[PDB]
Design a protein around this ligand. Structure first.
Ligand SMILES: Cc1cc(C)nc(SCC(=O)Nc2ncc(Cc3cccc(OCc4c[nH]nn4)c3)s2)n1
Ligand SMILES: [Zn+2]
Length: 291
């Protein structure tokens, strides 16, 4: 009685173009931005003593930031991407939006590429925050600053201070010690009542609470993983995990390869390849031509 006629990319595409599939939730992580040249700082090959930290994790912790922000901002300058060109995966989500299929994109990423690709605030749950905006850290002020302002401060090596009250200004990313945005929990509680398809791309589903999102889907909702490695199955030691391969599997599909190549394959099955090619090449040309 399952919704997918077969547990393959072709089965998912046929489901997507049936009347049963109207609302797609994307869950995306660092794997959708590595081909944009933005490394996954959790991947060890792209994972410091120049900052003389009391302990290595302090540069990611909020109390240390508020007392000693200079290491964080020097690291931010070191890591600042040289260009912001969203990937095929990002623009595939923009096509989902254009076609009225995108209920929400939950992202682990802080690089703003979802917004550059044309997803709007309403479409996005930035579960780990974002560099897109920054705020004065004083509770009585909370003046908001755009990324252009923060970038100027970062590259000029001037510690960003609020123009109204001279408190620190912090990018809206979730440091260790900060809670996830309330938007994450509010949206989760509403969106997963409404979803027809979960598209999980470029995440190992290891960081919490983001990973537990897959268990919030209704029992019937197909879940497609596009990722370099299989992810989201129950841990045989610590264990609604993914079931891709057992005789009881009925709704979870793993497409193992590069995220851009999987999204391209899905778009091609859907008849969207020309639309996606045209969109990516136009937007990339526009970004490359920024003057
Ligand atoms: C600079 C820049 C600008 C723009 C537009 N984009 C980029 S993207 C490339 C990248 O890595 N940059 C980084 N700068 C700082 C980082 C450390 C850090 C601290 C605290 C929470 C962090 O992340 C939230 C979180 C919590 N738990 N999981 N994630 C990260 S990393 N970089
Ligand atoms: Zn202020």
């Amino acid at each position: 009685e399952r919704l997918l006629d077969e547990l393959t990319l072709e089965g998912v595409a046929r489901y997507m173009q049936s009347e049963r599939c109207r609302r797609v939730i994307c869950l995306v992580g660092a794997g959708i931005s590595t081909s944009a040249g933005i490394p996954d700082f959790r991947s060890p090959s792209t994972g410091l003593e120049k900052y003389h930290l009391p302990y290595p994790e302090a540069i990611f912790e909020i109390s240390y930031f508020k007392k000693h922000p200079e290491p964080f901002f020097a690291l931010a300058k070191e890591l600042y991407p040289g260009q912001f060109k969203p990937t095929i995966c990002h623009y595939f989500m923009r096509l989902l939006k254009d076609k009225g299929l995108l209920l929400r994109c939950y992202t682990q990423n802080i690089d703003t590429l979802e917004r550059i690709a044309g997803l709007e605030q309403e479409d996005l749950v930035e579960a780990h925050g974002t560099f897109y905006t920054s705020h004065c850290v004083s509770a009585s002020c909370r003046h908001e600053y755009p990324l252009s302002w923060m970038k100027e401060k970062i590259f000029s090596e001037v510690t960003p201070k609020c123009e109204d009250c001279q408190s620190l200004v912090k990018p809206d990313i979730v440091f260790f010690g900060e809670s996830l945005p309330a938007r994450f929990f509010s949206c989760m509680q509403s969106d997963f009542l409404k979803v027809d398809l979960l598209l999980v791309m470029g995440t190992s589903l290891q960081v919490q609470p983001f990973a537990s999102l897959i268990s919030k889907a209704p029992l019937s909702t197909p879940r497609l993983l596009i990722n370099k490695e299989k992810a989201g199955q129950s841990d045989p030691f610590l264990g609604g995990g993914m079931d891709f391969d057992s005789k009881k599997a009925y709704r979870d599909v793993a497409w193992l390869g590069e995220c851009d190549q999987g999204c391209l394959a899905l778009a091609e099955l859907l008849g969207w390849k020309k639309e996606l090619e045209d969109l990516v090449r136009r937007e990339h040309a526009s970004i490359d031509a920024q003057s």
